[PDB]
Amino acid sequence: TNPYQRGPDPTVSSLEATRGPFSTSSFTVSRPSGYGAGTVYYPTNAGGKVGAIAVVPGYTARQSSINWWGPRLASHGFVVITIDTNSTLDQPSSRSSQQMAALRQVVSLAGTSSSPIYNKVDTARLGVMGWSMGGGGSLISAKNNPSLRAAAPQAPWAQASFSSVTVPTLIVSCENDSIAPNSSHSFPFYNQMTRNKKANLVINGGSHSCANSGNSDAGLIGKYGVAWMKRFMDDDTRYSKFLCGAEHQADLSKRAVEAYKENCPYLE
């Protein structure tokens, strides 16, 4: 019935694992169009076209900060492009422009017969992620392009307001962030968004890098990122229980969950 549904029925163990069920590969973008550099991660056996997600680092940072998301999401049925920005010193509006450029190049490569992702992407189903100024850029992308299916920034930094956002947005926040303090960034952004499905996962004791490659909470954080993108990029209500149901409630006793805010249930 759901034409976008891919893969086996999820379990807690399957979403906390380092990899999902699908086999994956990756390639470097030969000629990046409107951004600095990219790596594309993709499933080889997803069982149909999949949505695509663009992930952007923060100020001074590169793909290595955020690229654990590439194999983690791709192995659950997504095409993921992890980027470097034209300059490590680019600010959120610029990061957002580059993020959308990266999505546009994934759309271009999906129509290119020589590309490994030829005919693999549903070019109508796109999402945004990123760290710090790249997370603020994700929220800007969603504000400016409401046809995006999902946003899942981490420790976002921005000097912008997001009251108009209608895109389903998960913010991952790090309790002890001194760089994008939640009292100035994550929490005001969450409170501003009155028009969308939303959630805010706050990681206990986390510094600003608490959701980056190599983090010690990747089972938990990766479960939420994947379940958010499945629910909203694929309309896959099999994943609702991890966001709003009994599985979600079971997480709330974990030491690593400082706080969790949401406007469940998420109705179709």
Side-chain angles (χ1 to χ4, degrees), residues 79-126:
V79 170
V80 187
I81 184 167
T82 61
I83 72 166
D84 290 313
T85 53
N86 289 144
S87 170
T88 70
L89 308 179
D90 288 336
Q91 289 165 250
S93 289
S94 178
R95 293 180 186 274
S96 175
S97 295
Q98 291 179 67
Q99 183 171 51
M100 300 305 302
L103 287 175
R104 193 183 76 99
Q105 183 160 32
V106 164
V107 167
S108 178
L109 291 172
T112 301
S113 60
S114 67
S115 187
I117 56 164
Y118 179 65
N119 207 39
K120 284 201 167 47
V121 179
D122 184 341
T123 63
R125 299 189 294 119
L126 304 176

Short mmCIF file of all heavy atoms in Angstrom, two decimals, residues 79-126:
data_model
loop_
_atom_site.label_atom_id
_atom_site.label_comp_id
_atom_site.label_asym_id
_atom_site.label_seq_id
_atom_site.Cartn_x
_atom_site.Cartn_y
_atom_site.Cartn_z
N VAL A 79 19.85 7.48 -0.06
CA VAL A 79 21.08 8.06 -0.68
C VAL A 79 21.53 9.25 0.14
O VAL A 79 20.69 10.11 0.42
CB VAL A 79 20.89 8.39 -2.16
CG1 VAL A 79 22.06 9.19 -2.70
CG2 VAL A 79 20.66 7.09 -2.98
N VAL A 80 22.76 9.27 0.56
CA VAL A 80 23.25 10.31 1.49
C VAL A 80 24.45 10.97 0.83
O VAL A 80 25.39 10.27 0.48
CB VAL A 80 23.65 9.77 2.88
CG1 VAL A 80 24.00 10.91 3.86
CG2 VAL A 80 22.54 8.91 3.43
N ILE A 81 24.45 12.29 0.77
CA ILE A 81 25.64 13.04 0.30
C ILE A 81 26.20 13.81 1.48
O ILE A 81 25.44 14.60 2.13
CB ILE A 81 25.37 13.89 -0.93
CG1 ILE A 81 26.66 14.55 -1.40
CG2 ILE A 81 24.24 14.86 -0.71
CD1 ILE A 81 26.59 15.15 -2.73
N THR A 82 27.43 13.54 1.85
CA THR A 82 28.14 14.29 2.90
C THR A 82 29.04 15.31 2.24
O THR A 82 29.81 14.90 1.33
CB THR A 82 28.90 13.39 3.87
OG1 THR A 82 29.89 12.65 3.13
CG2 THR A 82 27.98 12.40 4.56
N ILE A 83 28.95 16.57 2.60
CA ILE A 83 29.71 17.60 1.88
C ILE A 83 30.78 18.29 2.72
O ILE A 83 30.67 18.40 3.92
CB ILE A 83 28.81 18.64 1.23
CG1 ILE A 83 28.13 19.61 2.18
CG2 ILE A 83 27.81 17.95 0.30
CD1 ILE A 83 27.53 20.81 1.44
N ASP A 84 31.78 18.77 1.99
CA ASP A 84 32.59 19.91 2.44
C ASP A 84 32.09 21.18 1.74
O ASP A 84 31.70 21.16 0.54
CB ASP A 84 34.05 19.71 2.04
CG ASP A 84 34.70 18.59 2.81
OD1 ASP A 84 34.55 18.59 4.00
OD2 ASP A 84 35.34 17.68 2.18
N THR A 85 32.09 22.27 2.47
CA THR A 85 31.67 23.58 1.97
C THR A 85 32.78 24.21 1.13
O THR A 85 33.93 23.83 1.21
CB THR A 85 31.17 24.47 3.12
OG1 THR A 85 32.17 24.51 4.13
CG2 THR A 85 29.89 23.90 3.71
N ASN A 86 32.37 25.17 0.31
CA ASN A 86 33.36 25.90 -0.51
C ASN A 86 34.46 26.46 0.36
O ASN A 86 35.63 26.46 -0.11
CB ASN A 86 32.65 27.00 -1.28
CG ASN A 86 31.75 26.52 -2.42
OD1 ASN A 86 30.69 27.15 -2.65
ND2 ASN A 86 32.15 25.52 -3.11
N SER A 87 34.15 27.00 1.52
CA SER A 87 35.13 27.47 2.52
C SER A 87 34.75 26.85 3.85
O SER A 87 33.54 26.85 4.20
CB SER A 87 35.05 28.96 2.63
OG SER A 87 35.80 29.41 3.72
N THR A 88 35.72 26.46 4.67
CA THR A 88 35.42 26.03 6.04
C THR A 88 34.83 27.17 6.85
O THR A 88 34.24 26.90 7.92
CB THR A 88 36.67 25.49 6.73
OG1 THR A 88 37.57 26.57 6.98
CG2 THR A 88 37.33 24.38 5.97
N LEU A 89 34.94 28.41 6.37
CA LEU A 89 34.47 29.59 7.10
C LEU A 89 33.10 30.08 6.63
O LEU A 89 32.64 31.19 7.04
CB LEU A 89 35.52 30.69 7.07
CG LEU A 89 36.90 30.20 7.52
CD1 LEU A 89 37.89 31.35 7.43
CD2 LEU A 89 36.88 29.47 8.85
N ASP A 90 32.41 29.29 5.84
CA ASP A 90 31.03 29.66 5.39
C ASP A 90 30.03 29.64 6.56
O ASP A 90 30.18 28.91 7.56
CB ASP A 90 30.57 28.68 4.32
CG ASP A 90 31.26 28.84 2.99
OD1 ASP A 90 31.77 29.98 2.72
OD2 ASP A 90 31.34 27.84 2.22
N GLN A 91 29.06 30.53 6.46
CA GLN A 91 28.03 30.76 7.51
C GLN A 91 26.73 30.05 7.13
O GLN A 91 26.62 29.44 6.08
CB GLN A 91 27.90 32.26 7.73
CG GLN A 91 29.14 32.80 8.44
CD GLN A 91 29.23 34.29 8.35
OE1 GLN A 91 30.11 34.80 7.64
NE2 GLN A 91 28.30 34.98 8.97
N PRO A 92 25.71 30.03 8.01
CA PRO A 92 24.55 29.17 7.74
C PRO A 92 23.78 29.39 6.46
O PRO A 92 23.39 28.41 5.87
CB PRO A 92 23.66 29.48 8.96
CG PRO A 92 24.62 29.81 10.07
CD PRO A 92 25.69 30.59 9.37
N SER A 93 23.57 30.63 6.01
CA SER A 93 22.82 30.85 4.75
C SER A 93 23.57 30.22 3.60
O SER A 93 22.94 29.59 2.74
CB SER A 93 22.59 32.33 4.51
OG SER A 93 21.64 32.77 5.47
N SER A 94 24.87 30.41 3.59
CA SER A 94 25.74 29.84 2.56
C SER A 94 25.73 28.31 2.63
O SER A 94 25.64 27.60 1.60
CB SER A 94 27.12 30.38 2.72
OG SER A 94 27.95 29.78 1.73
N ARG A 95 25.81 27.77 3.84
CA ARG A 95 25.76 26.33 4.05
C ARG A 95 24.43 25.80 3.49
O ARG A 95 24.41 24.71 2.89
CB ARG A 95 26.00 25.94 5.51
CG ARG A 95 27.41 26.25 5.98
CD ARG A 95 27.68 25.88 7.43
NE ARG A 95 29.04 26.36 7.76
CZ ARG A 95 30.15 25.66 7.53
NH1 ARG A 95 30.10 24.37 7.34
NH2 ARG A 95 31.32 26.27 7.56
N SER A 96 23.32 26.50 3.77
CA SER A 96 22.02 26.05 3.23
C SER A 96 22.01 26.03 1.72
O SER A 96 21.55 25.05 1.09
CB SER A 96 20.89 26.95 3.78
OG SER A 96 19.66 26.59 3.16
N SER A 97 22.52 27.07 1.07
CA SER A 97 22.60 27.14 -0.41
C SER A 97 23.41 25.95 -0.93
O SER A 97 23.01 25.28 -1.89
CB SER A 97 23.23 28.40 -0.87
OG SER A 97 22.36 29.46 -0.49
N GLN A 98 24.49 25.64 -0.25
CA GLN A 98 25.38 24.52 -0.67
C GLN A 98 24.72 23.17 -0.45
O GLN A 98 24.92 22.24 -1.24
CB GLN A 98 26.72 24.65 0.02
CG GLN A 98 27.50 25.85 -0.50
CD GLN A 98 28.81 26.00 0.21
OE1 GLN A 98 29.65 25.14 0.04
NE2 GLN A 98 28.97 27.10 0.96
N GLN A 99 24.03 23.02 0.65
CA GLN A 99 23.25 21.81 0.96
C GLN A 99 22.25 21.56 -0.17
O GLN A 99 22.10 20.41 -0.61
CB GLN A 99 22.56 22.02 2.29
CG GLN A 99 21.76 20.83 2.77
CD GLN A 99 21.31 21.05 4.18
OE1 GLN A 99 20.73 22.10 4.49
NE2 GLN A 99 21.60 20.10 5.07
N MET A 100 21.53 22.58 -0.58
CA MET A 100 20.52 22.39 -1.64
C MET A 100 21.22 22.11 -2.98
O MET A 100 20.66 21.38 -3.80
CB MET A 100 19.60 23.61 -1.70
CG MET A 100 18.83 23.86 -0.40
SD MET A 100 17.87 22.48 0.19
CE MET A 100 16.77 22.16 -1.20
N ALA A 101 22.37 22.74 -3.18
CA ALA A 101 23.17 22.45 -4.39
C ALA A 101 23.55 20.98 -4.39
O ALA A 101 23.63 20.35 -5.50
CB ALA A 101 24.37 23.33 -4.48
N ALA A 102 23.96 20.45 -3.26
CA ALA A 102 24.36 19.02 -3.15
C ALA A 102 23.15 18.15 -3.49
O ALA A 102 23.28 17.15 -4.19
CB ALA A 102 24.95 18.78 -1.80
N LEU A 103 21.97 18.43 -2.92
CA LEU A 103 20.76 17.69 -3.31
C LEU A 103 20.51 17.78 -4.81
O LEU A 103 20.17 16.78 -5.43
CB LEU A 103 19.56 18.22 -2.53
CG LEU A 103 19.51 17.84 -1.06
CD1 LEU A 103 18.36 18.50 -0.34
CD2 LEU A 103 19.47 16.34 -0.83
N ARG A 104 20.65 18.96 -5.38
CA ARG A 104 20.41 19.14 -6.81
C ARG A 104 21.38 18.30 -7.63
O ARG A 104 20.98 17.69 -8.61
CB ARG A 104 20.64 20.58 -7.19
CG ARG A 104 20.13 20.96 -8.57
CD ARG A 104 20.43 22.42 -8.98
NE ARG A 104 21.80 22.41 -9.33
CZ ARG A 104 22.26 22.33 -10.57
NH1 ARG A 104 21.45 22.66 -11.57
NH2 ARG A 104 23.56 22.05 -10.73
N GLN A 105 22.62 18.13 -7.16
CA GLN A 105 23.59 17.31 -7.90
C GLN A 105 23.26 15.84 -7.72
O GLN A 105 23.46 15.05 -8.67
CB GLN A 105 25.03 17.64 -7.52
CG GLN A 105 26.02 16.81 -8.37
CD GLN A 105 27.37 17.44 -8.38
OE1 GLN A 105 27.80 18.08 -7.42
NE2 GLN A 105 28.07 17.24 -9.52
N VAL A 106 22.73 15.44 -6.56
CA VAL A 106 22.27 14.03 -6.43
C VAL A 106 21.12 13.80 -7.42
O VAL A 106 21.07 12.73 -8.07
CB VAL A 106 21.85 13.70 -4.98
CG1 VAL A 106 21.03 12.43 -4.94
CG2 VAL A 106 23.07 13.71 -4.09
N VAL A 107 20.18 14.75 -7.54
CA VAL A 107 19.08 14.66 -8.52
C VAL A 107 19.68 14.54 -9.93
O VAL A 107 19.24 13.69 -10.75
CB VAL A 107 18.12 15.85 -8.36
CG1 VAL A 107 17.17 15.96 -9.52
CG2 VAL A 107 17.40 15.70 -7.04
N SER A 108 20.69 15.32 -10.26
CA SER A 108 21.35 15.33 -11.58
C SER A 108 21.99 13.95 -11.82
O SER A 108 21.78 13.33 -12.89
CB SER A 108 22.40 16.38 -11.64
OG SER A 108 23.07 16.36 -12.90
N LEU A 109 22.72 13.44 -10.83
CA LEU A 109 23.41 12.14 -10.97
C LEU A 109 22.38 11.00 -11.08
O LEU A 109 22.62 10.03 -11.79
CB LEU A 109 24.36 11.93 -9.80
CG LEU A 109 25.57 12.84 -9.79
CD1 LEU A 109 26.35 12.68 -8.50
CD2 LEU A 109 26.45 12.52 -10.99
N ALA A 110 21.24 11.10 -10.43
CA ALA A 110 20.18 10.09 -10.56
C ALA A 110 19.65 10.00 -11.98
O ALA A 110 19.11 8.94 -12.33
CB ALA A 110 19.05 10.40 -9.59
N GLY A 111 19.84 11.02 -12.81
CA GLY A 111 19.45 11.02 -14.21
C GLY A 111 20.64 10.79 -15.12
O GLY A 111 20.41 10.95 -16.31
N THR A 112 21.81 10.49 -14.58
CA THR A 112 23.06 10.30 -15.37
C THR A 112 23.39 8.81 -15.47
O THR A 112 23.73 8.20 -14.48
CB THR A 112 24.17 11.11 -14.73
OG1 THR A 112 23.86 12.52 -14.67
CG2 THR A 112 25.49 11.00 -15.48
N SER A 113 23.33 8.22 -16.68
CA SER A 113 23.40 6.75 -16.80
C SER A 113 24.73 6.22 -16.30
O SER A 113 24.75 5.11 -15.78
CB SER A 113 23.09 6.32 -18.21
OG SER A 113 24.04 6.92 -19.04
N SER A 114 25.81 7.00 -16.34
CA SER A 114 27.16 6.58 -15.90
C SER A 114 27.31 6.59 -14.38
O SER A 114 28.34 6.10 -13.86
CB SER A 114 28.23 7.47 -16.55
OG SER A 114 28.19 8.81 -16.10
N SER A 115 26.37 7.19 -13.63
CA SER A 115 26.51 7.31 -12.18
C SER A 115 26.08 6.06 -11.44
O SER A 115 25.10 5.40 -11.82
CB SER A 115 25.60 8.43 -11.65
OG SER A 115 25.87 8.61 -10.27
N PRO A 116 26.75 5.68 -10.32
CA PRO A 116 26.27 4.57 -9.53
C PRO A 116 24.87 4.73 -8.96
O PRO A 116 24.29 3.72 -8.62
CB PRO A 116 27.30 4.48 -8.39
CG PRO A 116 28.55 5.07 -8.99
CD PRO A 116 28.06 6.19 -9.87
N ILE A 117 24.38 5.96 -8.85
CA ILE A 117 23.01 6.16 -8.32
C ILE A 117 22.00 6.41 -9.44
O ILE A 117 20.89 6.81 -9.15
CB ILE A 117 22.97 7.26 -7.25
CG1 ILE A 117 23.51 8.60 -7.75
CG2 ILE A 117 23.69 6.75 -6.01
CD1 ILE A 117 23.12 9.76 -6.85
N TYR A 118 22.33 6.17 -10.69
CA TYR A 118 21.36 6.27 -11.80
C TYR A 118 20.10 5.52 -11.44
O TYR A 118 20.12 4.31 -11.13
CB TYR A 118 21.97 5.73 -13.10
CG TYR A 118 21.02 5.79 -14.25
CD1 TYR A 118 20.59 7.01 -14.73
CD2 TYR A 118 20.54 4.64 -14.86
CE1 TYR A 118 19.71 7.12 -15.78
CE2 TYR A 118 19.65 4.73 -15.91
CZ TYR A 118 19.25 5.97 -16.38
OH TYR A 118 18.36 6.02 -17.42
N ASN A 119 18.97 6.22 -11.51
CA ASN A 119 17.62 5.66 -11.36
C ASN A 119 17.44 5.08 -9.96
O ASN A 119 16.52 4.27 -9.81
CB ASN A 119 17.33 4.61 -12.43
CG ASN A 119 15.86 4.49 -12.73
OD1 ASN A 119 15.16 5.51 -12.76
ND2 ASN A 119 15.38 3.27 -12.91
N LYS A 120 18.22 5.48 -8.95
CA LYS A 120 18.10 4.91 -7.59
C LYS A 120 17.33 5.87 -6.66
O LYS A 120 16.99 5.44 -5.54
CB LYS A 120 19.44 4.65 -6.93
CG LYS A 120 20.15 3.41 -7.45
CD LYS A 120 21.16 2.93 -6.46
CE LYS A 120 21.68 1.55 -6.74
NZ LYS A 120 22.05 1.43 -8.15
N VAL A 121 17.18 7.12 -7.08
CA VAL A 121 16.64 8.18 -6.16
C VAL A 121 15.24 8.61 -6.59
O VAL A 121 15.02 8.94 -7.75
CB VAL A 121 17.56 9.40 -6.18
CG1 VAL A 121 17.03 10.51 -5.29
CG2 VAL A 121 18.95 9.00 -5.72
N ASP A 122 14.31 8.67 -5.62
CA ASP A 122 13.05 9.36 -5.84
C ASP A 122 13.31 10.84 -5.61
O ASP A 122 13.49 11.25 -4.45
CB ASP A 122 11.98 8.84 -4.87
CG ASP A 122 10.63 9.49 -5.17
OD1 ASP A 122 10.62 10.57 -5.84
OD2 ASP A 122 9.57 8.92 -4.74
N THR A 123 13.47 11.57 -6.70
CA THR A 123 13.94 12.96 -6.65
C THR A 123 12.89 13.89 -6.06
O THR A 123 13.24 15.06 -5.81
CB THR A 123 14.47 13.36 -8.05
OG1 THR A 123 13.34 13.28 -8.92
CG2 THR A 123 15.62 12.48 -8.48
N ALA A 124 11.72 13.40 -5.72
CA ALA A 124 10.72 14.21 -5.01
C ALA A 124 10.86 14.03 -3.51
O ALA A 124 10.10 14.67 -2.78
CB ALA A 124 9.34 13.74 -5.41
N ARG A 125 11.76 13.17 -3.00
CA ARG A 125 11.78 12.87 -1.54
C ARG A 125 13.16 13.15 -0.99
O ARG A 125 14.08 12.29 -1.15
CB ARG A 125 11.32 11.44 -1.27
CG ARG A 125 9.89 11.21 -1.74
CD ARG A 125 9.30 9.89 -1.30
NE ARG A 125 9.98 8.72 -1.92
CZ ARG A 125 10.61 7.75 -1.26
NH1 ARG A 125 10.90 7.82 0.05
NH2 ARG A 125 11.07 6.72 -1.96
N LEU A 126 13.35 14.37 -0.48
CA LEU A 126 14.68 14.89 -0.08
C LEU A 126 14.67 15.44 1.33
O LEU A 126 13.62 15.89 1.84
CB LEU A 126 15.06 16.01 -1.05
CG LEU A 126 15.07 15.65 -2.53
CD1 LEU A 126 15.38 16.91 -3.34
CD2 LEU A 126 16.03 14.51 -2.89
#
